[PDB]
Design a protein around this ligand. Sequence first.
Ligand SMILES: CSc1scc2c1-c1nc(SCC(=O)C(C)(C)C)ncc1CC2
Length: 147
Amino acid sequence: AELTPILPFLFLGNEQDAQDLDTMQRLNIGYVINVTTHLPLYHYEKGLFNYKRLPATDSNKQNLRQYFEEAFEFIEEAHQCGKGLLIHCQAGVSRSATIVIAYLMKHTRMTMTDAYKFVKGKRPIISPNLNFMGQLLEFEEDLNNGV
Ligand SMILES: CSc1scc2c1-c1nc(SCC(=O)C(C)(C)C)ncc1CC2
């Protein structure tokens, strides 16, 4: 089980990574973003983490931009109190990688391609999604136009 550390407090995984309770505690994680409609909130009944579900599918019609601001406020809440955040979806981490890159574009001022090269360097297997790609391109333009 590999929870990829993108930033010192931001971790990226899939469904399998999200079920390793011991590693999550070793990484000082206290926040979890579940970017699926159907997976459970793993370890919810143990009362150890704050959870947020963004109910998305890995399709060519899913809107992920709508969840960006909601996800950034949760990331910054963990960031500001010294805890780690895990964001995960499924196999090819397409959905969760979109939100991670969007954060890097907004809160690190990286371009879209520099953000992708940074993420791909730490987690080499990332499945493409042309729809999510197109939304990050419009997100980059809205950042550059102060919107
Ligand atoms: C911003 S992504 C990007 S920018 C320039 C390229 C790419 C790219 N990405 C991917 S996979 C990553 C994804 O599709 C999501 C994270 C959006 C789900 N495969 C191939 C390429 C070719 C070149």
